[PDB]
Amino acid sequence: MPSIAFSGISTKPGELEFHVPSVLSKHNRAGLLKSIDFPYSQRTIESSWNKLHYMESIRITPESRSVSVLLTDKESGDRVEMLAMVPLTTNKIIEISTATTDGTIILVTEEPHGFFAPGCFGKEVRNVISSYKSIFPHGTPPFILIHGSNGSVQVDPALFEYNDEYSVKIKYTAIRTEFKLFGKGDHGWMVTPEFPTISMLCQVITNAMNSAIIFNHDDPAARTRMYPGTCSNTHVIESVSGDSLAKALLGYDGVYAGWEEITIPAGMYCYGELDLSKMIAAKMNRWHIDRESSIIFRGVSGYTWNVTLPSGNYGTPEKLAHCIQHMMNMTAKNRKNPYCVRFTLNEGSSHRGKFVFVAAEPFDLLFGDDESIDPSILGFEPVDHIGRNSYMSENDLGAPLMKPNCNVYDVDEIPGTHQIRIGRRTRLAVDGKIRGYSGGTLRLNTVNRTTGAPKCHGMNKGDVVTLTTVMPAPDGATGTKREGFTFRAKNKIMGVVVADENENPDASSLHVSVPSMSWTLGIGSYITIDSQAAPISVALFDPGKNQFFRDSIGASRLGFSNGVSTGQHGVVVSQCAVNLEPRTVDVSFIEGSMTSASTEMYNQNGKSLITQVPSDRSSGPVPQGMVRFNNALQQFKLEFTNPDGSPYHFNHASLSLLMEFDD
Amino acid sequence: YDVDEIPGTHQIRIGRRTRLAVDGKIRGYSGGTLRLNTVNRTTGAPKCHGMNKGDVVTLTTVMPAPDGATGTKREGFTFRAKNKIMGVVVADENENPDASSLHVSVPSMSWTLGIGSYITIDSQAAPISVALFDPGKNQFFRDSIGASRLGFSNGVSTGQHGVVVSQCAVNLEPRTVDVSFIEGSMTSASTEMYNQNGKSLITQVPSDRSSGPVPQGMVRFNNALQQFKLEFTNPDGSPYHFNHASLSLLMEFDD
Amino acid sequence: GTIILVTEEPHGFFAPGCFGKEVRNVISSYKSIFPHGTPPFILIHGSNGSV
Amino acid sequence: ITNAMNSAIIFNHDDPAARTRMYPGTCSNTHVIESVSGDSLAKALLGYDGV
Amino acid sequence: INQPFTTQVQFGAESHITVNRQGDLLSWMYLKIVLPGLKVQNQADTVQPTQQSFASLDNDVAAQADVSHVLPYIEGAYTEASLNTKEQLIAEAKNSYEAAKYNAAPLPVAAQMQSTEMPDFDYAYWTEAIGFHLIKRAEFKVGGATIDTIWSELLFAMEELMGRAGRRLTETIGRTLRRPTELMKASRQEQILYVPLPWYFTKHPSLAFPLVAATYHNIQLWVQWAQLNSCIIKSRSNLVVLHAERNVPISDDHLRASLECTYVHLEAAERDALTANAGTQLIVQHQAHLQQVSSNNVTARLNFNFPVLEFYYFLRRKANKDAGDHFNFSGIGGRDPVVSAELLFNNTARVTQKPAVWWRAVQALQFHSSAPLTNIYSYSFSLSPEDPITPSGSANFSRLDSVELALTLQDDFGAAHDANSELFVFARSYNILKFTNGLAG
């Protein structure tokens, strides 16, 4: 019995090919595997499985609200188009007509209101918003009017009557206690809640379809499916169309397109060198700066400037780039060499891009200085970038796909259960200094309640905010006492965050459409601004369980079940302990390399194994594996599989095996 | 260079330190050559500059002292140019090479007015390339520590910013030792154990004493044996180093 | 209005034309070989600094 | 060096092998490489089997 | 009868089917493949832009590789030239290169400037002959033993040589004869392909596989699928490729396939006779030698076994493979990659050095139903290698100590950008399949 050492270098995950010397290529030999020198080179997180997918609440916008279904009648062959329109999260009122002889008011909206589904298949016109009372959690108001002189007003959806696609009737008596003046020229906002889950959105679309068509979301599969409901006997579904919502729900074999993606760096997270929980939190909070941080740069004159970035949520890389650009140009005072800072998307990508710093003259970015901001936020290495007029980040960063995160997350492992928890931080209200009020819009500079420094607010167009008189400073506040603007309303003052086309988007400048009050008397004074915190849903799948989430870290590794996990309070907890430990590796022959190998070892799936490599070098030697070869062997291929069935990653490590052959 | 193991990935990093500029006291200027004594920017003591003939340096007016500087305030020579002042480090055949004496060919300016004053001198920092090979992979790098031990691939790894990082974690742990017969000591030995290369093994010694006893190995000898030779190989195929240690083995023979 | 710059050592900027090829400026190729922003050539001793 | 050779001769460095190799480029049809000489650079690049 | 796979069908995976016993013999076998229609969207407009990379026409790696070979022959300031001036300089350098290497007379520059009229809109398409390219390997198994193996490259070579006039597989495999505009048109909608699997039993009715005689063996087809990244070409590098109906990024689970088998039902007397005595069938098996090419001189050591009827060989440039042109067996600038070849048995010339045209055109003219449109070379030991039932010559490679195919390739083949070009050699060999007591081997 000659023993032969075989050495191989893996060119592919999970597969090694070995050449048998011609001296041994005789027919009908048993090979005993004596030992494997296994490299244990597979990372806890590999570049092939480093994604986590999550979402907050689903906002309905003018571009993402409609699903159309073409139905064909089975008897006549006639074609009927069926449109579901979902109500907008925020819709502006453009006119309020005064009282017909019956005391009804007509409210005219900027966009089609979507409150009434057209009567179809002999059904009456259905109020879609009336169904929100049964779909949303208890205490969620189905509908709010903003701009009442008395504050925000919850209105029963059943009090609305259809007038046309852009206008609704309501009895003045239903709203009389609250309607005392819409200001001349700003008629306020219609507000509906954002959807906590795809399942709740599918129930509203089903109701807007008068249950002629049923939309169901399967959380275990992370898939939306459409079925014929009450029209199933009379009509066939021919096709589906619609806006960005229809494409998002159905365009990817029912997988929702609005999942935010984080990429975790490949590495060892089981040995305590890298903290996976902190890394997930850092990647979810990519556009949140916890503390005031400095960018250090030097111009051609040899003068070094320090630029202090405001703390808070920038929301998008473009808002961050623009803030850096603005602050660099203000600090350098030099109109002759304007610094330009931009985020640039990669060709063919909608959401991956790089930071680019440009000036007319050469300048240096001092990112190797310990007082500088962590350059990894900007995708740069922590080294000084010198002697160029242009710098582009080495690393690709992800911009938000739909809506930037309104939450900031902590990710921690629960002591004693070892369960991962993804929890939103307590959202702190911001103080806003009143800069001006014109045309129903209040202009505010947002500041940190503790320090009084500028604070990036993370709010976006169509966000609904609550306005209060300046709240007492938090315990341990170091900032100066702020003079509060005092206002009183019967109900909560709400406002809608609006874009202003005329002002540079400083991430600390906040513009809000607000009820007509004496806001001009408050110029220079402060108010407190709060916004609602969103739920979180996390989509996690083990390898091969879902075709869209194939590059996911794995549900089982993070202690999750395969599917969508939702936290209504912005907190999701794993069902099981986190398991990042190296796992056993099943070693088998690749089918078709041999017409017949007998083994005594089988895995749980009945697959023939040569051996099982232990999780680590300390667990003992690799078990001996007897293999019988029925034919003359010139070459054989070995397959190395993880217990999840994924291919083992050799990371360019070599492997050596010792086989003893019978005579 | 700083060399460190990256926390949580266990990857070795060979990184250049931030090259600190040196202050140079102007001693003299003659024939386009500026003569400088180099000093530490923090302490003001003499500092060896590491620069050599043909090095290209940038000259600036004395920069502000670093934070936490303990040295006395230095009087800076002020000069202005539209572009960066560069100079070439030159040898001076007439001066003893004190590693703190720096001679630079510089543009013709009023440098003689700066005698006794200070300027700041900076030089570009180089990239690094590291050549690492496992035993037997390259005939020239045969005495290399091994690419795989340091988490490197076999070959040249280049860091354009003077920083190179290993692809994998460092693995310095003792590895298993393959035990086999030397070919030609025996006309035929049958074994049930083979390594990954198809080489017949007697046994595989574990990485350490704590991993368990050495597996039993059955060997059949077809001939009368007066002597045998054993080969002990690491998993990389390199010979095991006994370091003058003795080894004992127990064999049971059939009757 | 041309200036001649005379060097201490052979400048090596021009490869001789061979095999029917024209004389090639070797330094002109540094713009495509070196990383972006590396100057292929600098003159030192300008009264205005490096060029 | 390949550009200074007008691509008549191609110099390639193989980083995995840490070896420099020389090949006939545009002269491959008309000429044969007889020998290589030069200063310390030629010896440094080619004298040790391309190491 | 159409039958689903026993395992999931996906790009880059292996799938198998256990063939049902719905008749007494198995005759024809087709892989029915369903490919979705393709659409494209800009990466900037996509909510999830992360997809596998595809070959793109704005990054023509094959054209860049061809330009790299003529760079030493470009006279003047190429780097600083306008685009139209660079195209002129490349066409002039091509004349100088071809004059120096081949003593070719110069072509007028205007005749070398073939604008392929590419459409001024965004598209993606399935690669040429996608029905063959999808089948990286298929194995016909009986009782767990592999009876025969076929490869994508072999299927294409077999259709080139044995494909009869008026019965070419064009539509059935998604082949347009390299007309990109037709591939684009076809790729906008769902495609149903019927790829014939040319097993020994599909070649003649008397060779139909006797299911009744093999009752105790499972019959299986195993298929290794091509990776999705290799199956698609796009107009531009920054495009995301979408499933045209579902409006989602194209993914590995969008491959659908089934097996269409023709069963034969026999009269009871013939069925009983065949069950009692199916005896032996003469079979043709396929063997493969696959080699990387890094030099203009290549020796392939053909370790094939059994009585070999014939062999095929051809080369693929790395640049053609990387461009997604998987069945482009041409050399540099579309030339013949082989200058000459020699066949040696035990270091003795069995066929002395012959030029490429002899191996490609003369061998095809003598022994095959068709001449190949691509650079496929053949050699037959058989007078009629396409006759599945009548042996007409062979060489027994199991009795030769060495069989060497020595190739002289074109200049610079396997150099620089074409390092790791591929040599394919396929052989057809006789064996015997025996049926006894409900078993086959």
Numbering used by the authors:
A (entry chain S): 1 to 663
B (entry chain S): 409 to 663
C (entry chain S): 103 to 153
D (entry chain S): 205 to 255
E (entry chain A): 51 to 491
Task: Pull verbatim passages from the article behind this deposition.
The population density of E. huxleyi is restricted by Nucleocytoviricota viruses, including E. huxleyi virus 201 (EhV-201). Here, we show that the dsDNA genome inside the EhV-201 virion is protected by an inner membrane, capsid, and outer membrane. Virions of coccolithoviruses are unique within the family Phycodnaviridae because they contain not only a membrane inside the capsid but also an additional membrane wrapped around the outer capsid surface, similar to the African swine fever virus from the family Asfaviridae. EhV-201 virions infect E. huxleyi by using fivefold vertices to bind to and fuse the virus’ inner membrane with the cell plasma membrane.
(F) AlphaFold2-predicted structure of EhV-201 major capsid protein with double jelly roll fold. The jellyroll cores J1 and J2 are each composed of two β sheets named according to the convention BIDG and CHEF. Therefore, we speculate that the amphipathic helices attach the outer virion membrane to the capsid.
